[PDB]
Amino acid sequence: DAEFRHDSGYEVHHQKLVFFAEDVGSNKGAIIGLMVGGVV
Amino acid sequence: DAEFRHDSGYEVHHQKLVFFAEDVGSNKGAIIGLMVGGVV
Amino acid sequence: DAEFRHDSGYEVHHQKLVFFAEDVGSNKGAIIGLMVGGVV
Amino acid sequence: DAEFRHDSGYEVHHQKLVFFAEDVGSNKGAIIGLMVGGVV
Amino acid sequence: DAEFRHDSGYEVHHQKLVFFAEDVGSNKGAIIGLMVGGVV
Amino acid sequence: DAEFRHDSGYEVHHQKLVFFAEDVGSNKGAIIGLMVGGVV
Amino acid sequence: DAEFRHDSGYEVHHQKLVFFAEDVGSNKGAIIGLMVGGVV
Amino acid sequence: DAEFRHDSGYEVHHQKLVFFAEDVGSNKGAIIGLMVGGVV
Amino acid sequence: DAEFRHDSGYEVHHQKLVFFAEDVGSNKGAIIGLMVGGVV
Amino acid sequence: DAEFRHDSGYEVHHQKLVFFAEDVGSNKGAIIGLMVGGVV
């Protein structure tokens, strides 16, 4: 007369989570505050 | 008459989590505060 | 009449977690505060 | 009539955690406070 | 009538943790406070 | 019979140039690549 | 019979130039690549 | 019969140049590659 | 009959140049590659 | 009949140049490659 109970508040089987962040808040290109040339 | 109970608040089986962060807050390119040339 | 109870608040089986951080807060490129040339 | 109880608040089996940090807060490129040339 | 109890607050089996830090806070590239040339 | 010539290719008198750069390419606030919480 | 010539290709008198750059390419506020919470 | 010639390719009188760079490419705030909490 | 010639390719009188760089490429705030807490 | 010639390729009178670099490439704040706590 087995109970054979399984009682898990959370059960997870076979879960793959990938979190990928690429290039957040980053500079791959020029940031210049001022360019000044040719000033007489 | 076995209970055969399994009672786990959390059960995790076979979980892969990948957290990848690439290039957060980083410079791969030029940041210049000022460029000044040719000033007479 | 075995209980055969398993009672674990957390059970983890076969979990792989990869945390990868690459290039956080880093410079691979030029940062210059000032460039000044040609000033007369 | 065995209890066969397993009672572990935390059970971990077969867990691999990799934490990788590469290049946090680091310079592989030029940081110059000032470049000044050609000043007369 | 064996209890066969296992009662461990923490049980860990087969856990590999790798913590890798490479190049935190480090310079592999030039940091110059000032470059000044050609000043007359 | 004085020539009284003044012959200057460039003449500058009384010139003030201010170049100000503030906060180019800079972080005064949080940059986070990932925030992850509450994952079961 | 004075020439009293003044012959300057450029003459500048009393010139003030202000170049101000504030907050170019900069973060004063949060940039987050991902926020993830409550994932079961 | 004086020439009284002044012949200067560049003449500068009374010139003040201020170049100010503040906070180029710099962090005054948090950069985090990953924040991960509460992972079961 | 004096020539009274002045012949200077560059003449500079009374010139003040200030180059100021503050906080180029620098951290006054936290950079963290990973923060991980609460992982079961 | 004096020539009274002055012939200087460069003449500089009364020039003050200040180059100031503060905090180039420097850490006044925490850089941490990893923080890991609470891992079971």
Author numbering:
A (entry chain I), B (entry chain G), C (entry chain E), D (entry chain C), E (entry chain A), F (entry chain H), ...: 1 to 40
Task: Quote from the publication.
In contrast, under post-treatment conditions, anle138b binds to the fibril surface without disrupting the overall fibril architecture, while still inducing localized structural perturbations. In addition, CD spectroscopy and negative stain EM imaging confirmed that fibrils remained structurally unchanged after post-treatment with anle138b, even after 96 hours of incubation at 37 °C. Interestingly, the cryo-EM structures revealed an additional weak non-proteinaceous density within the fibril’s central cavity, going from 0.31 without anle138b to 0.51 in the post-treatment fibril condition to 0.73 in the pre-treatment fibril condition. DNP NHHC spectra reveal that, under post-treatment with anle138b, the compound binds to Cγ atoms of Ile and the Cγ and Cδ atoms of Lys28. These residues are located within the loop region and exposed on the fibril surface, indicating that anle138b interacts with the fibril at the surface under these conditions. Isothermal titration calorimetry (ITC) thermodynamically characterized the surface binding of anle138b to L1 Aβ₄₀ fibrils, revealing exothermic binding with a dissociation constant (Kd) of 0.64 μM and a stoichiometry of ~0.72 molecules per monomer. The observed substoichiometric binding ratio can be explained with multiple binding sites for anle138b in surface-exposed regions of the fibril, rather than the central cavity.
Therapeutic antibodies can slow down the disease, but are associated with potential severe side effects, motivating the development of small molecules to halt disease progression. This study investigates the interaction between the clinical drug candidate small molecule anle138b and lipidic Aβ₄₀ fibrils of type 1 (L1). Each monomer is composed of three β-strands, with a long transition region (Ala21-Gly33, hereafter referred to as the loop region) located between the 2nd β-strand (β2: Lys16-Phe20) and the 3rd β-strand (β3: Leu34-Val36). A cavity is formed at the interface between the protofilaments arranged with 2 fold symmetry, with the loop regions from each monomer contributing to cavity formation.
